[PDB]
Amino acid sequence: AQARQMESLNRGLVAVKTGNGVFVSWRLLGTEPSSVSFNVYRNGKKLNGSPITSSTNYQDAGGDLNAVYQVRAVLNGREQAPSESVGVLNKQYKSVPLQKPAGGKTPDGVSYTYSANDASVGDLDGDGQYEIILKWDPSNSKDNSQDGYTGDVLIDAYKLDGTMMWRINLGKNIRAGAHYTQFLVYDFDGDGKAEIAMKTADGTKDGKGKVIGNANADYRNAQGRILSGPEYLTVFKGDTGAELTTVNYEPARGNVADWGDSYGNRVDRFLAGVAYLDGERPSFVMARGYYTRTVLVAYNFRGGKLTKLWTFDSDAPGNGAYAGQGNHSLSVADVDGDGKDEIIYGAMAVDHDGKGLYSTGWGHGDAMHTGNLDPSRPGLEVFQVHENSNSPYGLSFRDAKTGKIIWGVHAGKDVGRGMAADIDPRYEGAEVWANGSLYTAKGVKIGNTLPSSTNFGIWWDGDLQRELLDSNRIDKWDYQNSRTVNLLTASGASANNGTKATPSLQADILGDWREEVVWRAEDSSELRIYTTTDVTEHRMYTLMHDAVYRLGIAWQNVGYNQPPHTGFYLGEGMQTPEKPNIYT
Ligand SMILES: [Ca+2]
Ligand SMILES: [Ca+2]
Ligand SMILES: [Ca+2]
Ligand SMILES: [Ca+2]
Ligand SMILES: [Ca+2]
Ligand SMILES: [Ca+2]
Ligand SMILES: [Ca+2]
Ligand SMILES: [Ca+2]
Ligand SMILES: [Ca+2]
Ligand SMILES: [Ca+2]
């Protein structure tokens, strides 16, 4: 009973030169009725796609590199104003060149360079096409448990044509590393353009060069950590990067040792997430802590003002079960039916008003997947893994609303990876895997092997199973032979963060409902946006117009990046998915 704000997008038309013709795909928008159809136009407004639809891709045999495409929606037998016009890509990726920052030297005395790291997307200027907001990582970035000085964290915005809109420098008082800066790109106020929200400090320099706080404060200690001095929360304006408003980060660190160590590990474990706590409009949550004291703080940014909505603190009375449950990521989804978003903080959940929903007591894990994994169960499921060898489960498949287990598997050990996806059509729903085994959504062990990666799942070819993504590979589970075969190796491109091996971004940002992959070139001279050329016979509303998925894109960069999920069941046997309840 609720419509959600959702980004006004253009048709997302993309064309790609293939052996034999040109491949084309476009969006089906969530503002459109299911009855819509399309005609495709090659060059001189030539109708080409003679009758109409059932998908939003089309293979054009008589297409060449000099061709120009437009598509026209048909609303009730009446063709509409054409889309934007596009040329043809001579390779299966779009190059976005980067203004790569020059290296530098820390007090350390050491030298360091930058590489393109985690990304997000948003419509910063309102033209109906996504920009890429990119985090730059210095080669001396640090995990929380490693001493050492780190280079400045920088965040750029780029249009798809390579236009660099601005650079923000977080400055010397924001340590570089996976668990420090978590950045949220969303249209919070509803003005139709996106803002950026993240944690700042004395000396962060906005996109117009304006310094926040004291440009001469240096709270870096001799171990390269910032364990003193004030802490800020800032939202910047999308098209310019300018400070809009800055408030005090909550909670502040206080006595560092109260978090469970004196050397600055547990205290600087951060997460963040966009959530429609309204059921209608976006909020965001900034989180601090998970091994230990765990605090979530929710906000709105509307009418130029940042307002605190609520605070959940595990130190607070009655909330002590909720400590030690958080993962190195979070999920966001209406799990209880009320139209409003709850926060699935790893092995615990917070309700939309700031109140504990449940704590499983199974403890912190390094991966999680929240979606409709078993389409035979109404409601969502959460499949995750757990670090605690003394946990009853090393992998657990539970009810997302109550937190009660559905099935789970005792390992007496850390299980540091786990995945969820429909890779086997013999079993309706998503299969899951971790710690040497592959299971049905019901908990039954399939075969004896498992896919060659346990990282990301990506919808890439034309079928309803999901494919696999790791390093610079897209792979496919051959469920008949129990082997992983390769569909694409993006040679020259590279993933990020060594063993995590994640892409800068995975997201349906162009064309068809299939997902695009944003990998950096090895030297970080360009980002590459890969889009599929597999003709599909399936049609769906753009994944960026689904609530759970869009919010998945917004937290992908967060902590140890996890892959996105749809709020509906996407896989073999799915129903023809219905128009989403949204406005633009
Ligand atoms: Ca834009
Ligand atoms: Ca806005
Ligand atoms: Ca809800
Ligand atoms: Ca609720
Ligand atoms: Ca961990
Ligand atoms: Ca379900
Ligand atoms: Ca399946
Ligand atoms: Ca597929
Ligand atoms: Ca796509
Ligand atoms: Ca990350």
Question: 475 a known binding residue?
Answer: no
Is position 239 annotated in a ligand binding site? Answer: no
Q: Is 313 annotated as a binding residue?
A: no
3-state SS class at 109 = coil
Euclidean distance between CA atoms 309 and 277, whole angstroms: 9
Distance 183 CA to ligand 10 centre (A): 10
Between the CA of 459 and the centroid of ligand 10 the distance, in Å, is 21
For residues 173 and 202, is the Cβ–Cβ distance under 8 A? yes
Which amino acid is present at 444?
A: V
> 186 among the known binding-site residues?
no
Q: How large is the greatest C-alpha to C-alpha distance in the chain, in angstroms?
A: 71
Ligand 5 centre to CA of 268 (Å) is 14
What pairs with residue 19 in β-bridges? none
Sequence letter at residue 372: N
Kindly identify the ligand whose nearest atom is closest to the C-alpha of 439: 7
Nearest to residue 135, comparing CAs of 123, 148, 117?
A: 117
Report which residue type is found at 183.
F
As a whole number of angstroms, the distance between CA 31 and CA 20 comes to 34
The alpha carbon torsion through 455, 460, 461, 463 (nearest 10 deg) reads 80
Phi, psi of 322 (to 5 degrees): -85, -5
Ligand 4: centre distance to CA 363 (Å) = 22
CA of 414 to the centre of ligand 5 (A): 9
Nearest ligand for residue 357 CA: 4
108 is annotated as contributing to ligand binding: no
Ion ligand 7: residues, Cβ under 5 Å: 422, 424, 427
For ion ligand 10, residues whose CB falls within 5 Å? 118, 178, 561
Tell me how far apart the alpha carbons of residues 550 and 556 are, in angstroms, rounded to a whole number.
Answer: 10
Does 355 count as an annotated binding residue?
no
Structure determined via: X-ray
Cα angle for residues 518, 280, 430 (degrees, 5° grid): 50
Q: Give this entry's resolution in angstroms.
A: 2.5
Q: In sequence order, what are the residues at sequence separation of 6 or more whose Cβ sits closer than 8 angstroms to the Cβ of residue 481?
A: none
Q: Is 501 left (phi over 0), alpha (psi -120 to 50) or beta?
A: left
Return all residues near 427 (Cβ < 8 A) that are at least 6 apart: 440, 441, 442, 446
As a whole number of Å, the end-to-end CA separation of the chain is 17
485: phi then psi, degrees, rounded to nearest 5? -110, 150
137 CB-contact burial (10 Å; exposed 0-12 / middle 13-18 / buried 19+): buried
The separation between CA 245 and the C-alpha centre of its own chain, rounded to angstroms, equals: 25
Q: Does 559 count as an annotated binding residue?
A: yes
Q: Which helix (H) or strand (E) holds 395?
A: strand 395-399
Ligand index nearest the alpha carbon of residue 543: 9
Residue 512's closest CA among 490, 487, 532, 488? 532
Ligand nearest to the CA of 12: 9
DSSP secondary structure, 183-220, as one string: -EEE--SSSSS-EEEEEE-TTEE-TTSPEES-TT---B
The ligand minimizing its distance to the Cα of 324 is: 5
How much distance in Å is there from the Cα of 128 to the middle of ligand 9?
A: 15
What is the C-alpha to C-alpha distance for residues 236 and 244, in angstroms, rounded to an integer? 5
User: 326 C-alpha vs ligand 4 centroid, how far in Å?
Assistant: 19
CA distance 322 to 285: 17
CA 513 – ligand 7 centroid, Å: 19
User: Where do the domains of the chain lie, and which CATH numbers do they carry?
Assistant: 1-91 (2.60.40.10), 92-584 (no CATH)
CA of 115 to the centre of ligand 1 (A): 24
* CA–CA gap between residue 396 and residue 369 (Å, rounded): 11
Q: What is the whole-number distance in angstroms between the Cα of residue 479 and the centre of ligand 6? A: 23
463 is in an annotated binding site: yes
Strands 131-138 and 154-158: antiparallel
Starting from the CA of residue 467, give the closest ligand. Answer: 8
State residue 266 phi and psi, 5-degree precision.
-60, -35
260 among annotated binding-site residues: no
> Is residue 522 marked as binding?
no
Rounded to an integer, what is the distance from CA 567 to the centroid of its chain? 14
Task: Report how far ligand 5's centroid is from the alpha carbon of 507 (Å).
Answer: 25
Contact assessment for residue 406 and residue 399, using Cβ atoms and an 8 Å cutoff:
yes
Q: Is 32 marked as binding a ligand? A: no
